[PDB]
Design a protein around this ligand. Sequence first.
Ligand SMILES: O=S(=O)(NC1CCCC1)c1cccc2nc(-c3ccc(C(F)(F)F)cc3)[nH]c12
Ligand SMILES: O=S(=O)(NC1CCCC1)c1cccc2nc(-c3ccc(C(F)(F)F)cc3)[nH]c12
Lengths: 543, 543
Amino acid sequence: TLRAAVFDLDGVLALPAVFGVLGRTEEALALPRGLLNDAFQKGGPEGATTRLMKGEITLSQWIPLMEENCRKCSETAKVCLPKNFSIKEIFDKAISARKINRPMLQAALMLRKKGFTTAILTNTWLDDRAERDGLAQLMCELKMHFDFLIESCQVGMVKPEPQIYKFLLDTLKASPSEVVFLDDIGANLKPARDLGMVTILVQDTDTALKELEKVTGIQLLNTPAPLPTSCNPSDMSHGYVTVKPRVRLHFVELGSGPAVCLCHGFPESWYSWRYQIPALAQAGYRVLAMDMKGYGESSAPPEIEEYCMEVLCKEMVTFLDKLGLSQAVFIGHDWGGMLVWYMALFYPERVRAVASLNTPFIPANPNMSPLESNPVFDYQLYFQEPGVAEAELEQNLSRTFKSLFRASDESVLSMHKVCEAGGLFVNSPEEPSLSRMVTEEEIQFYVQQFKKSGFRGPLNWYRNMERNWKWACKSLGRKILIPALMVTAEKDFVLVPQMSQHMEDWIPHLKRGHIEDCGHWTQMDKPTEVNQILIKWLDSDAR
Amino acid sequence: TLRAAVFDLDGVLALPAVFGVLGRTEEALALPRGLLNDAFQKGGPEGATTRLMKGEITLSQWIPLMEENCRKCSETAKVCLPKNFSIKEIFDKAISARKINRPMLQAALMLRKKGFTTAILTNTWLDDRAERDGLAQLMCELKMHFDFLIESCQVGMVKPEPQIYKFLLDTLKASPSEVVFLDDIGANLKPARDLGMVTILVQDTDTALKELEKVTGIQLLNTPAPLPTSCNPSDMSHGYVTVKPRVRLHFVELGSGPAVCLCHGFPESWYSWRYQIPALAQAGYRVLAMDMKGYGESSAPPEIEEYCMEVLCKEMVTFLDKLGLSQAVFIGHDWGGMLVWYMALFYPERVRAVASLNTPFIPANPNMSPLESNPVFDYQLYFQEPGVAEAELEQNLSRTFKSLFRASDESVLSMHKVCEAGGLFVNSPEEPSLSRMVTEEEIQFYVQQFKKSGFRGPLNWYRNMERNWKWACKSLGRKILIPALMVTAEKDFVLVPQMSQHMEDWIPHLKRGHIEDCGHWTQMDKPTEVNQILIKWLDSDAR
Ligand SMILES: O=S(=O)(NC1CCCC1)c1cccc2nc(-c3ccc(C(F)(F)F)cc3)[nH]c12
Ligand SMILES: O=S(=O)(NC1CCCC1)c1cccc2nc(-c3ccc(C(F)(F)F)cc3)[nH]c12
């Protein structure tokens, strides 16, 4: 019974294969067939390429040795190498042309999700070219999806030497009959075969996956669309900044490039951006996913006024200052979306670009205090009285999140007549069913985050209605002229798309996004669509 | 008795003043004298510029209003504005031309060091131009050096209205006679004067500083060279990454741009880079100052083999992977310098550029085990026996750091015949004097860091001599071909400049740095020189 899957890099997990490009260059340069591939392999176990693959020498020290092998090979074939012949150029272009074989990575991901141990076993070199970052970027995106990465240059052993296969077996803690080994080179497949491993000679990906599906019994081809990569909380870099005595802000950080500040809603976590964090990082951004004040590992002072928009915004500015960031792109959802419009309104200098998921920008009415409103969205009135909603929401944490985190068609909670009913969960079951959006594990992460501070801090965000209105009134003569994106979600019955209709009177250059069949919990409801809209907008409006 | 100093931004803390550029543009465009400055101030308290300074409108909404004021002013003067006349261009160039007035910032820093409360009071706008990052960068570098930053657009009040001066007084918690107010505009100086504040009309910086030195009694002009900005540990962003179960790495992070990994020596801290962290961040780099394994807030497992170079290097790679960084510039000192050469040797793909302070690169001798050596640098033998050196170094933490952290001429500890003497501190006083390099406060920071794990982890770095040699021997055929810098320190009697003499046989493209009258503790001994060498090398060899 198979329990481990081993994949090669070149010609398996990454396409096109550099070996195939040597053949491509020889036909373009009208060189004799095999000349370059033969120069590459000259002296076999005793040759220059074996030394490079064993980590004895670096790529740059190898270029001159390959040049000599090429010259010698061309002399015995009685041909001439062209005038501009350069192994450096040939290999630079080859390495750069090589991209991830997405369907092969997808199948490796599927096998691992089904409890398989996965590994990359590759004959590779120590890359010291000025262009090495290209390969380092490829290796990083690939390695994260596997249990092990075995590189010849790191272990001092090469395929097809038997020791590397015995090394692989020991690393996997598996018997040979328990392993599927996938390779594009017949020769490197034979020693795995001799030990008794299942072997797949990869030419075209489809046939290779048909063989892999047949032998594993797991559907690898024609599967439904997978979810984007998520976050394992213990694998993240956790950051902490003291913004004022007694108030410290927690964040998760991933990637390099322009800074992207992710601001969650009520009653959420940095973890609500789990499907965005890896995608935006891979897209070339330095993601900072916040635990907003009152939540998770961030401070939760008890006082109501500590959660007014003015204070939260000033603290976000201090957060940038202490991290030494002149600007960040501010992306918010729900209450985070509200903060985000205010950051753009009050601190346009510190906001590269601003994006809101669901939460529209509506200017304060200077003639009417918002406290005056009305049982249509009465959860607001219910959230006002300190202690009441804290008691209901903290009673059973697991029930709170299973009742709240529900998709469009999953019998969502009523937001009307909640004061009359005397609670949010008064017509909800004691043991709600688990939503298709979340696992029991993800629900339990939220449960643990809420055990520290509870719901006072989070609810205090609803308790500064008049204070926020007074401050919002100071911005009545301003417009938002920095890059802005408004993302509406069709089936959000609290933050309705229609509520956003007039935003263009105040944000003339506003760009829009729209998600059909999407409820309130946008990030987890439609992560694939959210990531597409955000990345396209970031690459155009935020560099 | 004065206890607070208040500074204006334009024409005081930042030069040239935008108002002076309006006069510059009018003489270049052959416009009537004062035309643009008069258009700028049109309608005074009721005008467009007052609205912009009160935060009623943003810069972009103001450009059209200034255009109209210019057209109206040119009509009454019976002149024509040129064909390409644009307030946008005039202001973009003006804002960008404005740089920090270094001698004025220096004096504000001096006054604050002497216990003065310092503040910036400025008439400023809400900048929403595409070019806003320039001003945001200027404001960030300036604001950090002051107790308060008061901006008209943020408080809804403007100079010369009396309320802003009363607001300033309340913010400073000071009586008027306790405050020095410095401004370049006579009109904005008069209300401070009326309240009873000491006022300085700033034209040229020298006369302004002469008046300021005379009234405060503190030498502000002709002072010796100040040290670079340091780090207040509680003002930093603290990052944590789990690299393997039970091993978590702590780091301090500051800045944006290419990633720069700072690796301290024995027995140090991230804090040893205190004078570099702000300088390299300001230079346009994302600094990550490590607490190396065994130190501070990083994990300190007890086992010796957990501190061999192979494991420390693999963990540094995992650190990059978890932060989602394909590369970092690796800068190391002492044992960190050793790690750094190995990162470049074993993982050139993950190292953008490599720099070592004091620690040379010397290839392992494959014919001789380094355990065989010799009482000349016998502190190595002394550090071998587990428990011995831990007991001496932990007995009195304050004494350990006061005895170790000493400048070239400060009667440094003997590194010879330490086994014969039976300890490092056997000929050292019980109460050492405080070195000119460190304050009692900085010594006490190290003391607190060492109370957690002690010296087992740090000493275990010296306990893998044979293991490191065996691994180093695998790299004997390689050269370092990535960008590299070797910084020698004249008076380092353990890591001697002469020890680095042959490095060019293995690092042909090696760039060098050299620090005269510098001991072992390079970063704190010569911070100004270290920062100059590092920044020049980073901007040329690391982008
Ligand atoms: O309170 S608001 O000002 N209401 C406005 C918005 C539309 C009508 C009035 C408000 C303002 C901005 C964002 C908001 N997100 C929520 C909300 C979120 C989750 C839950 C749940 F957890 F119960 F599901 C209930 C309410 N409310 C928000
Ligand atoms: O142990 S080494 O291999 N010695 C080599 C280096 C030159 C001769 C042999 C070694 C290798 C690399 C870096 C080193 N930094 C120190 C050191 C640092 C501080 C203290 C102090 F805290 F005591 F001051 C004592 C010794 N030693 C190092």
